[PDB]
């Protein structure tokens, strides 16, 4: 995390908690975008004078660029940089994790990127701490909604329908 550590008690506004091998984070409902680590909002689709400072993506806003004539661009929030057209923590610029993603280490006072892996993998000290070693992760999510439990979906833990339910879970 770049801010406070996300926990099982964190409320994701217009979002929901997900778990990987080394952290929790908020994922947005439908097509919303993160304006911070705990808040999702609608995004604008074009950056100009009318949409300045509006969210244009995960951890990005339309920012006034002080160029030859003034222009506007979707620019990552403080602490983030564009890598493959998505905003990731600056200290993750050069970090490659494979079956996972880079996060800031909330246990380190020096800002440092570490790999947090898909459910199934763990940091491999033999392989530059990338997500190449197979390993188990205990799910921390409570999943108190109707007929819901922590399930692994596409490499991440999320609360989902129990055995025999689809769409609230019926």
């Amino acid at each position, epitope marked *: 995390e770049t801010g406070a550590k996300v926990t099982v008690d964190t409320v994701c506004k217009r979002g929901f908690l997900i778990q990987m091998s080394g952290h929790l984070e908020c994922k947005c409902e*439908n*097509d919303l975008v993160l304006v911070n680590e705990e808040t999702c909002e*609608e995004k604008v689709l*074009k950056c100009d004078e009318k949409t300045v400072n509006k969210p244009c993506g995960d951890f990005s806003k339309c920012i006034k660029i002080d160029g030859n004539p003034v222009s506007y661009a979707c620019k990552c929030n403080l602490g983030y940089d564009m890598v493959n057209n998505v905003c990731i923590p600056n200290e993750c610029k050069q970090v490659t994790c494979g079956n996972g993603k880079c996060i800031l280490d909330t246990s380190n006072p020096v800002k440092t990127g570490v790999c947090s892996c898909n459910i199934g993998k763990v940091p491999n000290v033999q392989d530059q701490n990338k997500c190449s070693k197979d390993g188990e992760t205990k799910c921390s999510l409570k999943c108190l909604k109707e007929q819901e439990t922590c399930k692994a979906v596409d490499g991440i833990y999320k609360c989902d329908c129990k055995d025999g339910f689809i769409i609230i879970c019926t």
Partner: antibody
Amino acid sequence: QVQLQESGPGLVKPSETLSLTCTVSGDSMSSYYWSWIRQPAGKGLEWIGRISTSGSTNYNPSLKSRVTMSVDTSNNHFSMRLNSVTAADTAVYYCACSGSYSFFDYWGQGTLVTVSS
Amino acid sequence: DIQMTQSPSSLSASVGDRVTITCQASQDISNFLNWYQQKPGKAPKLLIYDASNLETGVPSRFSGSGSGTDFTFTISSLQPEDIATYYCQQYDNLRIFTFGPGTKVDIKR
């Protein structure tokens, strides 16, 4: 910046499906939310629904069961279909768009649709 | 129907007059309220967005203020080309666009 131009059938028979097309020139369609808005003669404006090229849809709940919309970026077309039309659907139909999700700063000229036998 | 109000429903003013129009949204919408000008036979034209921001190229005599539910639109000095119906337009938490009933401004000459 984009320029919008509606085209429609003029007449549509009652209970049949109204099909409209908005031809777009200028910026990429992916940079805008695309909406249809209609206005009966001497009446106010009714927003019908909003979509984006990403596949997101945001139809007015009053018309969701009758209306669908789509974008064809290959031919720069933004379309809507309104099922089971009646005389209450006679109106000027506008296409409109914006990079913002909460207003409309680009408008077509409107096309008048008359439901009639 | 979701209820919005605009006052007055119509008005007749002289060139140079100060014109003030009010709009009340159906709920607290913060600043998600926009003002459009629809001249006869033409599409609506956005003049004010986000309650108080002037659209690029719109004359400085147009302005808007307000937040929450109660909003005003002001033409500081009415000009002949300003005759039109003016609509406020809200965007609520259900992502629904609703236009107000509109205010028609005519000119006394």
